Amino acid sequence: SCIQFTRHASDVLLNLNRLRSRDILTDVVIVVSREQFRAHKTVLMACSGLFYSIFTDQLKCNLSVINLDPEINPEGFCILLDFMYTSRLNLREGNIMAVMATAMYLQMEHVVDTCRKFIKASE
Amino acid sequence: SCIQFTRHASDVLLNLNRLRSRDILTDVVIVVSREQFRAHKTVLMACSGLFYSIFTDQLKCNLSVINLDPEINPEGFCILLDFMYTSRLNLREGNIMAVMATAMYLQMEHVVDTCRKFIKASE
């Protein structure tokens, strides 16, 4: 018999992104080919199968720095980190291959799906 | 020129609630008249003007235990904590006064608004 507030989830995500932009309560640095990205472990886990596995590990859950595979493109990661905190994906002809490869590595199934569809339309 | 995934914010909140239910990466205990509630500081801040003020304070941001005012009803808090992580509010004739008072103290403006409207309809 609950009532539901339609905009609640969007408002929560908007506030989490405001915290990220002001570097409030960020608890991890993600290192991508020397580029560094500060974030909230819980948000990373909520969006990515890879981060979910990493931060549920009894040893890795305590790390303040995570280094990604050197094949990962920092721009592709940045676009995906922005998507995690906003639901918006900056998908362009020039970045789609790097975004898809990064989403496959991060295990972000819905992003991989839209990249496959956009690539298939161009062939 | 971004594309947007409609269900992303809801899916993020659903995963954050799964983490809460398994007590994964919870970093604070909220004490309400001896009852204890584990939660994520970032989610509490994203939903409540009171928690936002508390955890942006340079001293309180580091506390692992927060004690609420003794006038706060634990059931009212529990219903609001559930709403924070799900967008669903269990509003009933028997709890509406405690829920509204708790939402006013926590500074959750949209919850206060629906409680005022439901109370006005019954008069």
């Binding site: 609950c2 009532i3 539901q4 339609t6 | 629906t114």
Partner: peptide, 4 residues
């Protein structure tokens, strides 16, 4: 607010 809605009935979910």
């Amino acid at each position: 607010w809605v009935i979910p």
